[PDB]
Design a protein around this ligand. Structure first.
Ligand SMILES: CN[C@@H]1CCc2c(ccc(O)c2O)[C@H]1O
Length: 281
């Protein structure tokens, strides 16, 4: 009396992610005024989110509902690799956008020289290749395999699908994918807030006779609340085995998936971009 219910919610999640990614991609592609050096990063992020929504979510949904993975083992390895790739690519694109905003605000005179049309494609390709090398190489080549009896029993079984890793690989993946971008974003947005406060004081210095907090708070809080608990649990269950069950792990992982859905809504809100929506519909 509960299978017919959660399926509807998961289908709505899939539809929302697909629609949110596709609308942004087509709006940027087919409209002349929208093209900008800063909009290419948004295009890369939208592509990563679309790949996530198209590939990762439905297969995991089917696996959760029917409780039996009705495909091979090569397919499950590929699915895990694609999931890791998409997650790390999304996070690194976020940190790249934050760094670009810092460069734009802190140094306005030299902003043109630092970033150009040629230098953005190279950065995007570098981000994508480092994201790909972190996931496919250690997974597709069986270098992350564990040494537990339950782990080998699960690995030998064809139908059963589950995730087991050694502690070292979990630590390395978490460090590469989450912590460093978070530190970079924190420093960037602290500096941006300081600059905004300084300008706000400077204006009221002469023009005699808030919003920055709202914007920075929403931008940081959405990402931090969506993704922070999952990586803490990721470290914890491999440092100590008894603490974390297999259901809390899945729930906290699935919490982070919805972040890709909200990202186009929070990042793309420019008035010209809404005008671009207006023409489409
Ligand atoms: C299938 N779930 C995976 C399992 C581990 C993992 C994820 C995402 C990023 C990482 O760096 C990881 O190590 C999760 O999406």
């Amino acid at each position: 009396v509960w299978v017919v219910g959660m399926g509807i919610v998961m289908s709505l999640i899939v539809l929302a992610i697909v629609f949110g990614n596709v609308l942004v991609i087509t709006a940027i592609a087919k409209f002349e005024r929208l093209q900008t050096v800063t909009n290419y990063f948004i295009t890369s992020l939208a592509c990563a989110d679309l790949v996530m929504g198209l590939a990762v979510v439905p297969f995991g949904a089917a696996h959760i509902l029917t409780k039996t993975w009705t495909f091979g083992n090569f397919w499950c390895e590929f699915w895990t690799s694609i999931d890791v790739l998409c997650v790390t690519a999304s996070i690194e694109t976020l940190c790249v956008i934050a760094v670009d905003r810092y460069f734009a605000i802190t140094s306005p005179f030299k902003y043109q020289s630092l970033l150009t049309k040629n230098k953005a494609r190279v950065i995007i390709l570098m981000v994508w290749i480092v994201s790909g090398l972190t996931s496919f190489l250690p997974i597709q080549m069986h270098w992350y395999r564990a040494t537990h009896q339950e782990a080998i029993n699960c690995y030998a079984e064809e139908t059963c699908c589950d995730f087991f890793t050694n502690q070292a690989y979990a630590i390395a993946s978490s460090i590469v994918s989450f912590y460093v971008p978070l530190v970079i974003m924190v420093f960037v947005y602290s500096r941006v807030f300081q600059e905004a406060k300084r300008q706000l004081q400077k204006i009221d210095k002469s023009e005699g006779r808030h919003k920055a907090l709202k914007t920075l708070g929403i931008i940081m809080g959405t990402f931090t609340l969506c993704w922070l608990p999952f990586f803490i649990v990721n470290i914890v269950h491999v440092i100590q085995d008894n603490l974390i069950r297999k259901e809390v792990y899945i729930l906290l992982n699935w919490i982070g998936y919805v972040n890709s859905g909200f990202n186009p809504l929070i990042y793309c809100r420019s008035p010209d971009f809404r005008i671009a929506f207006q023409e489409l519909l």
